[PDB]
Amino acid sequence: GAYGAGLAH
Amino acid sequence: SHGNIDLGFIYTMGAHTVPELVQNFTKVESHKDITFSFFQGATKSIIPDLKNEKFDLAICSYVENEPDIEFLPLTKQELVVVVAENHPLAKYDSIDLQDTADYSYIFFSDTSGLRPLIDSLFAEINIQPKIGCYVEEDTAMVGLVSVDYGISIMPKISSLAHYNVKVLSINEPKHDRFIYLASLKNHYISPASKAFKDFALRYGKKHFL
Amino acid sequence: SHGNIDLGFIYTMGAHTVPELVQNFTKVESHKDITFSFFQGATKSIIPDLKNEKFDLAICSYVENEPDIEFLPLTKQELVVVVAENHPLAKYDSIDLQDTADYSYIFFSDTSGLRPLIDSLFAEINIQPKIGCYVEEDTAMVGLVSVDYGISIMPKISSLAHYNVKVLSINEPKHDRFIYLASLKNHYISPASKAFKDFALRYGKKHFLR
Ligand SMILES: O=C(O)C1=C[C@@H](O)[C@@H](O)[C@H](O)C1
Ligand SMILES: O=C(O)C1=C[C@@H](O)[C@@H](O)[C@H](O)C1
């Protein structure tokens, strides 16, 4: 679930 | 089938995460004969060892302005504040980071891939923490907190429950601490390394994230 | 006393030994103003950082043919064999090192100052251990033993009790694992660093070395 969120920088 | 994987990773991944990945990777029959060499260190040491190809793959913190490196989300951690059981903050169960302003920190050294996140949290609330000393690795940090040499902000890891310290959750500011599978962009990677890379990314999506 | 002490040490010293030394040192009024920075690593990396003066003092393994470094005994550890909790060797409470001949090791890498002692123990009993993988740091080692990825020989440390592993004492061969306070020989040492060196050696003699 949090994978997409983890791509944001 | 056959081949070797040189994997470098940040310290807290040694206790449980890397073993879980390796255990599950290796139960597949076609992976039984693949071998590993495992290296431990801080993110800032690990990145050069990726570029010079000492490591096939790495698990570490994201680092800005490393366009040659691909960072893919693998897992996450919760940052907590850790204090000796006699410390004034030990009476609480959760705190705001600005509530620590008066107290001396055992801080992560500049080599730590966690320092960008941590520094941004203190900057967000406009607090300049009192830093008493620096350490790099996590057990040395909680060791010093346990004799009340200072307090710390650090990842919540299983060993904290075995020191005489109180672990406090952080209400404000908000944070996400992600950990990444790191590899060289546009670089040739061995069949075993690619197999482990894809496996670990699937595993993290299903079990870690 | 005032000034800073840069202290480098091998990983297992962070959990308890360095905290104990620093806490007891700092109780003294004339030591309250001394500051520290603490560095962690393996012996083979620590030695150059003593020579290049990144560290004022180090706590690490003895290294042969380092005439520029003074090693003085500080503490000691017990080597044990660690196996997954359902490993065939877990049926025992103590073993001889040769009882491990059939099993794959999670071995310390060449950077480890423990490897001279460990290698000599296997050479003494004329056994060539099967090595499945190498690791440098101790929690990574017991982490892998805990998933039965291999067995290991390592220092008995407090964290072992919290993994799914059985700790086996070693009957034969028996040899002492000493840890040393290391410094540059005949080199200027600051008042704070000297105070800490003398304190730590006295403390280790009284409480660590038996
Ligand atoms: O992400 C990193 O580079 C690290 C995080 C900390 O937990 C420590 O394990 C150490 O500072 C390395
Ligand atoms: O004496 C040493 O240099 C070391 C001993 C081991 O316990 C590990 O902490 C690591 O291999 C470093």
DSSP secondary structure letters along C176-195: -EEEEEEEETT----HHHHH
Task: Tell me the C-alpha distance between B125 and B98, whole Å.
Answer: 7
Q: Are residues C10 and C64 in the same domain?
A: yes
Domain that holds residue C71: 1-77+176-210
Task: Tell me the C-alpha distance between B37 and C136, whole Å.
Answer: 10
Task: Tell me the C-alpha distance between B83 and B102, whole Å.
Answer: 13
> B12 is written with which tokens?
């807290």
Task: Tell me the C-alpha distance between B131 and C193, whole Å.
Answer: 20
Task: Give yes or no for a contact between B158 and B16, defined as CB atoms under 8 angstroms apart.
Answer: yes
Q: Are residues B111 and B60 in the same domain?
A: no
Q: Mapping DSSP to helix (H, G, I), strand (E, B) and coil, where does residue B17 land?
A: helix
Task: Give yes or no for a contact between C60 and C180, defined as CB atoms under 8 angstroms apart.
Answer: yes
Most B-contacting residue of C18, C130, C147 (CB-CB within 10 A), to test interface: C147
Q: Which of B4, B167, B160 is nearest to B83 (CA)?
A: B167
Q: Which of B179, B187, B182, B177 is nearest to B197 (CA)?
A: B182
Q: Please report residues of B whose CB lies closer than 8 A to that of C196.
A: none
Which position has the token pair 């870690």?
B208
Dihedral class, residue C186 (left if φ above 0, else alpha if ψ from -120 to 50, else beta)? left
Q: Are residues C85 and C161 in the same domain?
A: yes
Q: Are residues C65 and C122 in the same domain?
A: no
Q: Are residues B94 and B151 in the same domain?
A: yes
Amino acid at B136: E
Amino acid at B78: E
Q: How many CA atoms lie within 13 A of C73 on its CB side?
A: 12
How long a stretch of residues is chain B? 209
Q: Are residues C63 and C82 in the same domain?
A: no
Q: Please report residues of C whose CB lies closer than 8 A to that of B109.
A: 37, 39
Task: Tell me the C-alpha distance between B93 and B90, whole Å.
Answer: 7
Query: What φ, ψ does residue C205 adopt, rounded to 5°?
Result: -60, -45
Task: Tell me the C-alpha distance between C25 and C193, whole Å.
Answer: 11
| Way it was determined | X-ray
Task: Give yes or no for a contact between C171 and C96, defined as CB atoms under 8 angstroms apart.
Answer: yes
Q: Are residues C119 and C186 in the same domain?
A: no
The resolution in angstroms reads 1.9
Q: Are residues B72 and B145 in the same domain?
A: no
Helix (H) or strand (E) holding B150: none
Q: Are residues B119 and B104 in the same domain?
A: yes
Angle, nearest 10°, between helix axes B17-27 and B191-207? 120
Closest partner residue to B149 (CB to CB) among C15, C23, C40 is C23
What single string gives the DSSP state of each residue in C124-178?
HTT---EEEEEESSHHHHHHHHHTTS-BEEEE--GGGGGSSEEEEEE-SS---EE
> B32 is written with which tokens?
């039984």
- Vertex C3 angle, CA B134 and C35, to 5°: 30
Which position has the token pair 């390592």?
C154
Q: Are residues B112 and B158 in the same domain?
A: yes
Q: Which of B132, B3, B142, B147 is nearest to B80 (CA)?
A: B142
Ligand whose nearest atom lies closest to the CA of B111: 1
The rounded radius of gyration (Å) of the Cα atoms in chain B is 18
Q: Nearest-CA residue of chain C relative to B4?
A: C133
Look at chain B and report how many structural domains it folds into. Answer: 2
Q: Are residues B46 and B58 in the same domain?
A: yes
Q: Is the peptide bond before B191 cis (omega within 30 degrees of 0)?
A: no
Q: Are residues B44 and B131 in the same domain?
A: no
Q: How many helices (H) and strands (E) does chain C have?
A: 5, 11
